[PDB]
Amino acid sequence: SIMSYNGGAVMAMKGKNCVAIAADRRFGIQAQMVTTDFQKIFPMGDRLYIGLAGLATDVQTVAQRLKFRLNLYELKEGRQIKPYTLMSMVANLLYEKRFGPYYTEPVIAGLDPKTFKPFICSLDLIGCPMVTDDFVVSGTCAEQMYGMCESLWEPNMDPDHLFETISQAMLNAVDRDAVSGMGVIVHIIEKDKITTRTLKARMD
Amino acid sequence: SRRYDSRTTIFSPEGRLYQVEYAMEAIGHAGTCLGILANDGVLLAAERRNIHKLLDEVFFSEKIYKLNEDMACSVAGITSDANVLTNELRLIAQRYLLQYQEPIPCEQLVTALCDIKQAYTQFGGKRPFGVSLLYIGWDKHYGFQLYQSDPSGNYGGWKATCIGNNSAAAVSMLKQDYKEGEMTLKSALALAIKVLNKTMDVSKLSAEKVEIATLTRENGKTVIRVLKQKEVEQLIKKHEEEEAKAEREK
Amino acid sequence: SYDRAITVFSPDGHLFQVEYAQEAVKKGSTAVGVRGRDIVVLGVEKKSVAKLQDERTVRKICALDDNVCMAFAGLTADARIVINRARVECQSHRLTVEDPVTVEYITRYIASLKQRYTQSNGRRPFGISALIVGFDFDGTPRLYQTDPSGTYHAWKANAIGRGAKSVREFLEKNYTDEAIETDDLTIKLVIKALLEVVQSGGKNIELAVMRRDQSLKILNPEEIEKYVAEIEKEKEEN
Amino acid sequence: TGYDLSASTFSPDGRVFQVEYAMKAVENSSTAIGIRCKDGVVFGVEKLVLSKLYEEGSNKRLFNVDRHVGMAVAGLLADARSLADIAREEASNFRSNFGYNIPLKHLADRVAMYVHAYTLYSAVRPFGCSFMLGSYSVNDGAQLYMIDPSGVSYGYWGCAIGKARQAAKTEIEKLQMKEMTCRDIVKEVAKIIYIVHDEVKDKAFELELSWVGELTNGRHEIVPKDIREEAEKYAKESLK
Amino acid sequence: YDRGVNTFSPEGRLFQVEYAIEAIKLGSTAIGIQTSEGVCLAVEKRITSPLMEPSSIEKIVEIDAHIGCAMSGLIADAKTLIDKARVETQNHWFTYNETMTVESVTQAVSNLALQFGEEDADPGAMSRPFGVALLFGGVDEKGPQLFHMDPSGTFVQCDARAIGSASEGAQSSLQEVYHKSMTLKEAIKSSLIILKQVMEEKLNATNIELATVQPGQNFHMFTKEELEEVIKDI
Amino acid sequence: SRGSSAGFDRHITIFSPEGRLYQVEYAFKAINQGGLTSVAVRGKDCAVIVTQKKVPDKLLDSSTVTHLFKITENIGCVMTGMTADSRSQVQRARYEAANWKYKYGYEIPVDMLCKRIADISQVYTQNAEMRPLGCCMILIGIDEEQGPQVYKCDPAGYYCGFKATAAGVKQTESTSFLEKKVKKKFDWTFEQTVETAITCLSTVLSIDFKPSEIEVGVVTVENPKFRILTEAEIDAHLVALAE
Amino acid sequence: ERGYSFSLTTFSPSGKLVQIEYALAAVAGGAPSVGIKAANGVVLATEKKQKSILYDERSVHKVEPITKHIGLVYSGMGPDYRVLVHRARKLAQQYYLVYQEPIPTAQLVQRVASVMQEYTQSGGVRPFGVSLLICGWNEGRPYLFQSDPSGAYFAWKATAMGKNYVNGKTFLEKRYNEDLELEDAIHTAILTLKESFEGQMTEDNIEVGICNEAGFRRLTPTEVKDYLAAIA
Amino acid sequence: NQYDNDVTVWSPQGRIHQIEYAMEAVKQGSATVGLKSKTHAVLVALKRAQSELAAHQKKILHVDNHIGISIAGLTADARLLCNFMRQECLDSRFVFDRPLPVSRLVSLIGSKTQIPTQRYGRRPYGVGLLIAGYDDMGPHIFQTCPSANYFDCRAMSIGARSQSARTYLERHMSEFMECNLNELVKHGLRALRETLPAEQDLTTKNVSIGIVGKDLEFTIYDDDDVSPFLEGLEERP
């Protein structure tokens, strides 16, 4: 219930060669909503976004520490992060607190720096790697989002259809959930651009 | 251990400190580093000594590193001390970024480095880091700003400064040919080429002998660009053309 | 793990390390401080102006609180760390007392830090002499001088660094009660004291003044130029 | 200098002069001799009487480090006391960790390793003491190990440490100590220690003697007094 | 360098402690006299320049309401020991609801004294012996008391002692003019006249610091007016 | 005659002007200080360590001065130099072998044990605050898939696999004998290996040693536990070599 | 164990670390080694000159791997090489544990350089008396790095440490091509080794490791002598 | 030379120069003569003062109700060891509820003083302790030299000019044991008297004693309370 203390919903699927990642925007205590413009998808690279769900404080702290170590590594090494390396590093970060786990289940989405092959993965509060080709979801909306994705997702999607599918997924998974929603932010990472969009969702 | 200690962290009878003096002398015979400021950016000119044909030279820069998102550095002296210093600087800069969610000001990071270097000279019984550091960067409070630090732990803010051989001649050239407040990127680059050609007259200006870096502020974003070999060749050609024109007019 | 006794008693009980720290202080830059009846003024010789240099970073006069400031003479880096530690002590006192800091207490704990470094293992004392200016709760001006040996004493006026003895011997004869009544006379006295040290007189010199809890500010270069002109006017009429 | 200042450095040839000086400091001390026989191990140590105001049995060079192990020492006596304390601590640890009294062989090996441990670092100096340990067991019999200040432990049918050690060794060679009787060997030890003692060099002197063996039920003990006067009388007669 | 901090002399004494005593004779001159009506402490300020404030030049410090101390030598090093003595006295008061005896304070100060080294204890410890001679004047259940604390740790209870630049000679003259049945007024007069005679410079109220401890009154330090009142007769 | 020293270059193990470590190279002659020669050989299926037993005095129990130490059941060792250093290295080798046995579930290979001992010796050489253990250890064992093995560490730490080597005062003469023997004969059986091992000491040192004047340990592939030869086997090998 | 807290390595009046110069002299006095780069891999070669044949030259190895894609050779003191390679192995394993990806050769060389610098600036220890020639393959690229006892590092297309090292460097420069193959790299390495072997090289006396996209692998004496026969 | 600047060095003659300096310092200390009888043990020490004005600082420390010590040498080290011994005595009384025997106390302090003889940069405690105590085995007198070596003794004299006192003790050791408490303390006082030259006097105002007996707890007597003991004393020999 600690991961549902603030609520959350994050997803990421794959297109033909592009990636769509989306998250809810509601932030607040278990009862009341404080802010409807909260950011939950953060850039770990030019072609790599990460979504975090769970306890908001743990979300922010994990994001800050991950950005810390990621920037340190990329300055020491001189190349943009590889998505597999970022996923392994964040999984190790979560595992370092095995007895003090961050109540967060993150997802990592983006493209290969050179191949542009779509990559998506998920973790848990301990940091279990979970690489699934079709889609990964996390948060309090887990069941609704899994049910949506396992029917709305198809392989080899164009960016526009990919955006439509993920937008419908978020809209129809948060409208049936009480501790999430109130606006959805969607990022579409294509080969040569990224599109950030806010869905016209029900604010309550 | 009394007889066999090196006691490098004590005073001297005349009040100086031999270890930092020797470090400064070693830096003096070490490679050449130059830092300058322009109205739209700051430029770095670093000279690489080991230029054997066996080098893979795959690295973007040898003595020039990137401390953080909006600040670059140039090292002078021992390159391993340079590497450990640079990654410590990156670590603490990212620490400030984590703690405050704001890019670390250049003065902050230079002050922290000078603190740790002075402490390392103060005690510990170890030989001090014999590397001079020349930092450039952009910040919210002062924008383009560059500092020169010393192994003794002292730092200073300069519009333009150089370290290495013929440091006095280089700073004299800057004082003679730097237009304060009216130095554009092109004229600053030309002055940097002049210094690189003059402060190291032996083994006259060569493309692979030096590396050139620039730091600018475009669209509220700090861009650090390392000039390629073709760029350095263009600088050499421009310097030769301007020197020939000046001599012909003379 | 580094615990070699650096500061030890030489023959006749002379702390040669303390003498070497004093030598480093003397070889350092020139700084003076006067404690006027209403204000406190610090003057530091900005020797080797070395144009194209941002003098803000090398300013040897740093304020500790809204009512406390110091100017050093000696090692710049040891000065910087001691200034950081003095900022720490002032803030800790303000937290634990929720009252304005006391200049004498600040100087005393800096002296205690210096004496701990003299008495510690594997450490050498801070080769800096510090002139600490400030004002108490009642607005009483305070001027204290501490040395690397750890001894701190309150002075009406004194000097540290290069030519410190000559400047203080000049001041002890040029210091009168009526000569520090107003800010103009105090500034002129400090400028004429530093004139014998600085060759430029107006451009290789920096002045800082603190009033009775009135947000101390550094004297403007134009003010320095016009006050050097004023002291030259006094010289030509005298 | 440089080759004799600390135990952490070799000579240009590869010698340890600090250990050699420790050997000198243990040689110039008073003599201490230990003889093992088929049914006991005896120790006779020579005590220098600085003044007659001292007690008999003062500043003993004989220590009882285990329930069945003695310790005859020579050299720096405070160092000997510290080494005896370490030996009894090791015996206590072995008894706690294994439930039975430590054998003399392993005790001597561990103590020699400990001694050699403080002959490697400049932060310490080699022990200025050599010591002989004797013990008895039902399955092992009488055992006697001599340990150098360097840290070398060997079994000895009979050993002597001190100034007149070599003379004590040489004259006692006529004794076939490996199958002798402890009671008469006590008298022979009194004899040898009297002859090897230099009355001119040390006018005032005293003897501390003890044995451990089967006659002691396998527990270290001092000589009973009556046997002490009897051995003293035999030694006086042997002085001739 | 070469010689350590725990090295003796061929005759069997620490030459570092001898150097500390030499520094003691380099310190400021201080005089302390104990009588049946209290104890008095005096010291010469050694004013370098008139610009130096006499207020900050005070060699006499209050350990407790009934104890005063006079320091000579490394005055910077003496304040740490003074703070330790005061905190230990207050700890004793906190533990036993009584004022700590002067003798116990002196013994504790000796315990803190001569505790230093390179690698002998926790690294955050002393490296050199204290180079300050102390005169602990106080009043307790045993009446007025005066203790000479030598930097060697050889604490001494003495009726009257003069230390500093002019320790010897002046102490003998003080003893010659000292008796076993002198009043507090006689004690302060004698100490003042001896200090004035041994002054290296013309002394006044701005050249000496005077303080006293009485059986009835607490530790009181003589202000300028009373200093002039007592010095005008001398 | 002006016995000058170049500061601390010749006093503690620091880099000398000639690119050498003086206290490391003093350990080579510190091996010679023991006055004892230890030579070891391996056959096609056996490894034999033959070492002369010094008896400076009968008054010590010569049955308890045996210098052959069993690190494990199947590993035996002999050392040269300071005897206390030898005992310390034997104890350390036993500790490391037992630790490997517990942490890895099988008996330590002889090469890895020698490598660990050499690393510890290098730890002494690297540090400038400890005596660099001027003692040399030679160990034997039987290894599956590789056969009998003999390994030798050193205070310097540079070890190597070898058919046969020696450590002691006359290690160079034993080296020369091993050269001539390997250039003369190659095929070795157990009895030939032990005869050559005895012949090495006999030819190099030329003592005509008594049976009680040596201590010999062997490892064979019939009972790989390290076993020490007693007087009977020593006399048998002596008379076999004599005839 | 106390541990000296004063750095044995100190700055000379000229600022030169003369102790590091003596370490480099010890490296030069050690067994020579060479390294060379090809357009699609790296080849490391070195000689193991032991005493008379009583030593089992097969038992000991000089070329050592760190990972499946990184190997290295040294010139200098074997005792220092063992601990240094063991620490490098630990660093590579730790990096693989943290990031679940193979160590890049540049990062591993940076870590080794940091370790060497820590040794040089710390107290109570001696500078390493070896020079490492490190070969590595990552991201479909070859890498060869020179690392000195001073703690610095460089990316060198060809290198030669040990005795006659300057002459070896010049010979490599004369016989180095920008776009050579692995076969040409092996030919050049063996030619340089035999030009500076001083004593009629043998397949046992030469041990060579090759690093390419397939990984790092040490050449056994069979193909070793095969290449020596093909090169003559 | 270099054999006298450290404690961990070995002299070629087989000695430690720091230990020699400590054993010279203990002799350079003030005079102290201790002795015992069959039932009682008494320490007699003359308290030196830096000047006539000083009050002759006490040299006899009260370590336990049944055990007492007298110091000769470094006062701070003596005080530290006295605190350490009294801590041991209180620990024994707290644990086993028995007075800690004198012999074991002296062995423990010897073991404690052995460690500085080996530790690097650690100086020996340059003070000698004359320990007078009573336990179940009668009175005991011990002398712990700064050399970390203790000596059990019937009567020992320490400090400068102690040869005359040592000769007196050797002469009258045959009769120390059987004399009563007053004769014993008189013999000790006469030994201390013979320690000093003829011109100086054994004044009551600079001599102190510490005595422990079969029924008497260890008590220290000063100038006023040593006057009855200073009755009928013969003039200086």
Q: Is A65 exposed, middle or buried (0-12, 13-18, 19+ CB in 10 A)?
A: middle
Q: CB-hemisphere CA count at 13 Å for D68?
A: 25
| G15 contacts G24 by C-beta, under 8 angstroms | no
Which residues are CB-contacts of B167 (< 8 A; sequence separation ≥ 6)? B28, B199
The secondary structure of chain G, three-state, reads CCCCCCECCCCCCCCCCHHHHHHHHHHHHCCCEEEEEECCEEEEEEECCCCCCCECCCCCCCCEECCCCEEEEEEECHHHHHHHHHHHHHHHHHHHHHHCCCCCHHHHHHHHHHHHHHHHHCECCCCCCEEEEEEEEECCEEEEEEECCCCCEEEECEEEECCCHHHHHHHHHHCCCCCCCHHHHHHHHHHHHHHCCCCCCCCCCEEEEEEECCEEEECCHHHHHHHHHHHC
Q: Which domains are seen in chain G, by residue range?
A: 2-231 (3.60.20.10)
- Between CA A58 and CA F80 the distance in angstroms is 62
Q: Which two tokens stand for residue G159?
A: 């290198």
Q: Which two tokens stand for residue D13?
A: 């040839």
Q: Which two tokens stand for residue B194?
A: 């002049």
Within F149-230, residue ranges assigned H as helices are: 171-184, 190-205
The full length of chain A comes to 204
| G204 contacts G128 by C-beta, under 8 angstroms | no
Instruction: Give how many domains chain F has, as a whole number.
Output: 1
Residue of B nearest to C55 (CA): B157
Beta bridge partners of H139: H134
Q: CB-hemisphere CA count at 13 Å for B236?
A: 15
Which residues are CB-contacts of H64 (< 8 A; sequence separation ≥ 6)? H85, H86, H89, H99, H100, H133, H218
Selection from H82, H102, H79 nearest residue H92 by Cα: H102
Selection from C186, C217, C131, C162 nearest residue C45 by Cα: C162
Are B6 and G176 within 8 A, CB to CB? no
Instruction: Give how far Cα H146 sits from Cα of D31, E150, H20, H143, H162, Å.
Output: 24, 22, 9, 10, 17
- Between CA A166 and CA A121 the distance in angstroms is 16
Whether C10 has its CB under 8 Å from any CB of chain B: the answer is: no
Q: Which two tokens stand for residue F163?
A: 């058919």
- Between CA C212 and CA D88 the distance in angstroms is 74
**F70, containing H or E segment:** strand F69-70
- Between CA E78 and CA E72 the distance in angstroms is 8
Q: CB-hemisphere CA count at 13 Å for H169?
A: 30
For chains A and H, having 3+ Cβ pairs within 8 Å is answered no
- Between CA A31 and CA H149 the distance in angstroms is 79
Distance from chain centroid for Cα H81: 13
| G132 contacts G74 by C-beta, under 8 angstroms | yes
Whether C24 has its CB under 8 Å from any CB of chain B: the answer is: yes
φ and ψ at C70, to 5 degrees? -145, 155
Torsion of CA A92, A94, A99, A103, to 10 degrees: -170
Q: Which of D1, D6, D9 to mutate to test the interface with F (most CBs of F within 10 A)?
A: D9
Query: Domain with F216 in it: what CATH number?
Result: 3.60.20.10
Are B98 and A67 within 8 A, CB to CB? yes
Whether E96 has its CB under 8 Å from any CB of chain B: the answer is: no
Within chain A, residue ranges assigned H as helices are: 56-77, 83-95, 142-152, 159-174
Q: Which two tokens stand for residue A7?
A: 């609520």
- Taking residue B231's Cβ as centre, other Cβ atoms within 10 Å add up to 15
- Between CA F78 and CA F84 the distance in angstroms is 13
Other chains touching H, judged by 3 or more CB pairs under 8 Å: B, D, E
- Whole domain around residue A100: which residue ranges? 1-204
Other chains touching D, judged by 3 or more CB pairs under 8 Å: F, G, H
Distance from CA of C47 to the nearest CA of B (A): 13
Distance from chain centroid for Cα E194: 17
- Between CA F99 and CA D225 the distance in angstroms is 52
- Between CA B126 and CA B120 the distance in angstroms is 7
Q: CB-hemisphere CA count at 13 Å for G61?
A: 17
Selection from G83, G126, D11, G62 nearest residue F21 by Cα: G126
Distance from chain centroid for Cα E163: 8
Query: Which residues of chain H make contact with E13, given a CB cutoff of 8 A?
Result: 21, 25, 28, 126
- Between CA C118 and CA C11 the distance in angstroms is 17
- Between CA E192 and CA E188 the distance in angstroms is 6
- Residue D54 per-residue DSSP state: B
Of C3, C108, C154, the CB nearest to E123: C3
φ and ψ at B106, to 5 degrees? -60, -40
φ and ψ at C106, to 5 degrees? -60, -50
| A71 contacts B101 by C-beta, under 8 angstroms | no
- Residue B85 per-residue DSSP state: H
The secondary structure of chain E, three-state, reads CCCCCCCECCCCCEHHHHHHHHHHHCCCCEEEEEECCEEEEEEECCCCCCCECCCCCCCEEEEECCEEEEEEECHHHHHHHHHHHHHHHHHHHHHHCCCCCHHHHHHHHHHHCCCCCCCCCCCCCCCCCCCEEEEEEEEECCEEEEEEECCCCCCEEECEEEECCCCCCHHHHHHHCCCCCCCHHHHHHHHHHHHHHHCCCCCCCCCEEEEEECCCCCEEECCHHHHHHHHHCC
**F25, containing H or E segment:** helix F22-32
Distance from chain centroid for Cα A46: 15
Instruction: Give how many domains chain E has, as a whole number.
Output: 1
Distance from CA of B1 to the nearest CA of H (A): 9
Which residues are CB-contacts of A204 (< 8 A; sequence separation ≥ 6)? A182
Largest Cα–Cα separation, chain E: 56
Within chain B, residue ranges assigned H as helices are: 18-28, 79-100, 106-122, 167-177, 185-198, 229-249
Residue of B nearest to G154 (CA): B55
Query: Domain with E21 in it: what CATH number?
Result: 3.60.20.10
- Between CA F204 and CA F171 the distance in angstroms is 9
| G125 contacts G22 by C-beta, under 8 angstroms | no
Identify the three-state secondary structure at position B216: strand
- Between CA F177 and CA F194 the distance in angstroms is 15
Helices B185-198 and B229-249: angle between axes, nearest 10 degrees: 80
Which residues are CB-contacts of H147 (< 8 A; sequence separation ≥ 6)? D78, H19, H22, H23, H124
Q: Which two tokens stand for residue G150?
A: 């001073």
User: Which amino acid does the sequence have at A24?
Assistant: D
Query: Which residues of chain B make contact with F12, given a CB cutoff of 8 A?
Result: 4
Q: Is H73 exposed, middle or buried (0-12, 13-18, 19+ CB in 10 A)?
A: buried
- Between CA F49 and CA H228 the distance in angstroms is 83
| A149 contacts A13 by C-beta, under 8 angstroms | yes
| Beta pairing class for E38-44 and F147-152 | unpaired
Are H8 and D6 within 8 A, CB to CB? yes
- Residue C10 per-residue DSSP state: -
- Between CA D44 and CA D25 the distance in angstroms is 20
φ and ψ at A111, to 5 degrees? -120, 155
Q: Which of B60, B62, B91, B92 to mutate to test the interface with A (most CBs of A within 10 A)?
A: B91
Tokens 């970390």 found at: H148
| G52 contacts F178 by C-beta, under 8 angstroms | yes
Distance from CA of H74 to the nearest CA of E (A): 8
Distance from CA of C112 to the nearest CA of G (A): 26
Q: Which two tokens stand for residue D148?
A: 């150098």
Query: Which residues of chain D make contact with H147, given a CB cutoff of 8 A?
Result: 78
Instruction: Give how many domains chain D has, as a whole number.
Output: 1
Which residues are CB-contacts of A61 (< 8 A; sequence separation ≥ 6)? A102
Distance from CA of G123 to the nearest CA of B (A): 7
The DSSP secondary structure of F105-150, one letter per residue, reads: SSPPPHHHHHHHHHHHHHHHHH-SSB----EEEEEEEEETTTEEEE
Identify the three-state secondary structure at position F153: coil
Largest Cα–Cα separation, chain D: 56
Identify the three-state secondary structure at position F10: coil
Which residues are CB-contacts of B161 (< 8 A; sequence separation ≥ 6)? B34, B35, B134, B146, B148, B171, B174, C52, C53
Are G123 and B126 within 8 A, CB to CB? yes
The secondary structure of F71-88, three-state, reads CCCCCEEEEEECHHHHHH
Query: Domain with C50 in it: what CATH number?
Result: 3.60.20.10
Q: Which two tokens stand for residue A67?
A: 């950005």
- Between CA H37 and CA H230 the distance in angstroms is 19
Which residues are CB-contacts of B246 (< 8 A; sequence separation ≥ 6)? none
Selection from B139, B153, B158, B164 nearest residue B222 by Cα: B139
- Whole domain around residue E95: which residue ranges? 2-234
Q: Which two tokens stand for residue G183?
A: 């076969």
- Whole domain around residue D168: which residue ranges? 1-238
Identify the three-state secondary structure at position A44: strand
Whether F122 has its CB under 8 Å from any CB of chain G: the answer is: yes
Q: Which two tokens stand for residue C180?
A: 């520090």
| H47 contacts H206 by C-beta, under 8 angstroms | yes
Helices C221-237 and C183-195: angle between axes, nearest 10 degrees: 80
- Between CA E42 and CA E55 the distance in angstroms is 15
Q: Is F176 exposed, middle or buried (0-12, 13-18, 19+ CB in 10 A)?
A: middle
Selection from H129, H159, H135 nearest residue H212 by Cα: H135
Query: Which residues of chain B make contact with C10, given a CB cutoff of 8 A?
Result: none
Instruction: Give how many domains chain C has, as a whole number.
Output: 1
- Between CA G187 and CA G210 the distance in angstroms is 13
Are B90 and A68 within 8 A, CB to CB? no
Selection from E75, E71, E107 nearest residue E89 by Cα: E107
- Residue H101 per-residue DSSP state: P
Of G99, G106, G107, the CB nearest to A88: G99
- Between CA H46 and CA H208 the distance in angstroms is 6
Instruction: Give how many domains chain A has, as a whole number.
Output: 1
- Whole domain around residue F25: which residue ranges? 1-243
**C159, containing H or E segment:** strand C157-160
Selection from F161, F198, F159, F172 nearest residue F51 by Cα: F198
Selection from H10, E85, C119 nearest residue D20 by Cα: H10
Residue of A nearest to G101 (CA): A85
Query: Which residues of chain C make contact with G5, given a CB cutoff of 8 A?
Result: 1-4, 122
Q: Is D174 exposed, middle or buried (0-12, 13-18, 19+ CB in 10 A)?
A: exposed
Selection from E143, E234, E221, E149 nearest residue E193 by Cα: E234
Q: Is A2 exposed, middle or buried (0-12, 13-18, 19+ CB in 10 A)?
A: exposed
| E157 contacts E103 by C-beta, under 8 angstroms | yes
Identify the three-state secondary structure at position C74: strand
Please list every residue in chain G followed by a chain break, i.e. its C lies more than 2.5 Å from the next written N: none
The DSSP secondary structure of C179-194, one letter per residue, reads: GGSSHHHHHHHHHHHH
Considering only residues 6 to 65 of chain G, which have any Cβ-Cβ distance to chain C shorter than 8 Å? 6
> Helix, strand, coil % (nearest 5) of chain F?
40, 25, 35
For chains B and E, having 3+ Cβ pairs within 8 Å is answered yes
- Whole domain around residue B88: which residue ranges? 1-248
- Between CA A11 and CA A187 the distance in angstroms is 11
Query: Which residues of chain A make contact with G106, given a CB cutoff of 8 A?
Result: 77
Torsion of CA E168, E173, E177, E183, to 10 degrees: -30
Identify the three-state secondary structure at position D158: strand
Resolution (A): 3.5
Of F20, F126, F156, the CB nearest to G126: F126
